[PDB]
């Protein structure tokens, strides 16, 4: 505690680094703000011989729990298979989108094994589009109203090739009985937007 601003991937000391990884992860201990972007990629869990990077222990992703704000974009293209949601980012409150994936996207979630997103603290995405893509076991994403998180005219979300709404319904994977029409990030009470 309290305020501690850290550089993100592809600026300052990480300017040549492709992903968060086993070598650089420690340097995020106790950051509350990222000044730039977070990239989370397959080479992180695989490791890489050419840059002498060891594989990353998934338990250490939990060092990102303190992070409340990212001034750039968040991009997750790999995640541990036995995590049902993005637990690490449960305290993320703001993605600004001052800088964007391919100039377009400020949040991007691509082909994970998750069954829910889990971003219960997310209240604002200031600029940039959202893309949730190819997550074959993901429910819940169509329940929230994204337009209420947006801050710039022209923001939209592409939610494509994910699990079907019908199959979620048949296995009781909908918002909890006590949520409001505002939707949820998961099956539990503590996951609804408004109470």
């Amino acid at each position: 505690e309290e305020k501690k601003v850290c550089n993100g991937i592809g600026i300052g000391e990480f300017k040549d680094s492709l992903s968060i990884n086993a070598t650089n992860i420690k340097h995020f201990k106790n950051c509350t703000s990222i000044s730039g972007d977070l990239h989370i990629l397959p080479v992180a869990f695989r490791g890489d011989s050419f840059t002498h990077t060891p594989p990353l222990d998934p338990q250490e992703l939990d060092i990102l729990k303190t992070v409340k704000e990212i001034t750039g974009f968040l991009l997750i293209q790999a995640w541990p298979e036995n995590r049902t949601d993005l637990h690490a980012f449960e305290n993320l409150e703001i993605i600004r989108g001052r800088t964007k994936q391919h100039g377009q996207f400020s949040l991007a979630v691509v082909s994970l094994n998750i069954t829910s997103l889990g971003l219960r603290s997310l209240k604002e995405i200031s600029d940039g589009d959202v893309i949730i893509s190819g997550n074959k076991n993901l429910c819940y994403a169509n329940t929230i109203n994204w337009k209420k998180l947006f801050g710039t005219s022209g923001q939209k979300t592409k939610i494509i090739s994910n699990r079907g709404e019908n199959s979620c319904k048949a296995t009781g994977q909908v918002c909890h009985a006590l949520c409001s029409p505002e939707g949820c990030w998961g099956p539990e009470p503590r996951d609804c937007v408004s109470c």
Partner: T-cell receptor
């Protein structure tokens, strides 16, 4: 899976005529819909994506609209090169699916 | 520049495995931007989606094929592949490979022959 239905399955027209193709989805797909053209012995060629948005190089007489469950491909005026099969395709939910196709046929 | 091409045997006996390779030019197959996919079409009939693979390892298959399909990557040749086991006459089809640009147009763009 979401089922896509194209009817009529065959349209019979002459050059210069206006063409109106229909596509229906059994569950909603927002605007996550594409149209393809296909000629014998050839792979399909993308015409329109997102309902809506025409692909680069695709001639202007080709246009599309609709949302949710109801879609329409419109060829304002046929050219001899437009006779072929047209398929609709949803990418909104897994598994991805296609419709049966409508074939554009030379009235004679 | 981007180019896809299917290859493999044109003939398979009932109950055996079907195998095909797609080769890719004009960009490395290891990339966050693309799903690499397969689609099939029996003569005189409609299009059917088979599945995809991503550079991260993860995959997605049509349940109509009853767990009979696997895909894999081979960066050694910039190639991806299909296996389909326990085949019958219902598997006769023109087989296509195709790319998806996840951050671009967001549906099949380049196709094989």
């Amino acid at each position: 899976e979401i089922v896509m239905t194209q009817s009529p399955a065959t349209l019979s027209l002459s050059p210069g005529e206006r063409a109106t193709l229909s596509c229906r989805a059994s569950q909603s797909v927002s605007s996550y819909l594409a149209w393809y053209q296909q000629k014998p012995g050839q792979a399909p060629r993308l015409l329109i994506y997102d309902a809506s948005n025409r692909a680069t190089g695709i001639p202007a007489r080709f246009s599309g609209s609709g949302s949710g469950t109801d879609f329409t491909l419109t060829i304002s005026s046929l050219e001899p090169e437009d006779f072929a099969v047209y398929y609709c395709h949803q990418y909104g939910s897994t598994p991805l699916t296609f419709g049966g196709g409508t074939k554009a046929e030379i009235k004679r | 520049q981007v180019q896809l091409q299917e290859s493999g045997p044109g003939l398979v006996k009932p109950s055996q495995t079907l195998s095909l390779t797609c080769t890719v030019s004009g960009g490395s197959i290891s990339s966050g931007d693309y799903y690499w996919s397969w689609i099939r079409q029996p003569p005189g009939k409609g299009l059917e989606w088979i599945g995809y693979i991503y550079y991260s390892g993860s995959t997605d298959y049509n349940p109509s094929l009853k767990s009979r399909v696997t895909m894999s990557v081979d960066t050694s040749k910039n190639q991806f592949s299909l296996k389909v086991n326990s085949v019958t006459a219902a598997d006769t089809a023109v087989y296509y490979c195709a790319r998806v640009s996840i951050f671009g147009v967001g549906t099949f763009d380049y196709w094989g022959q």
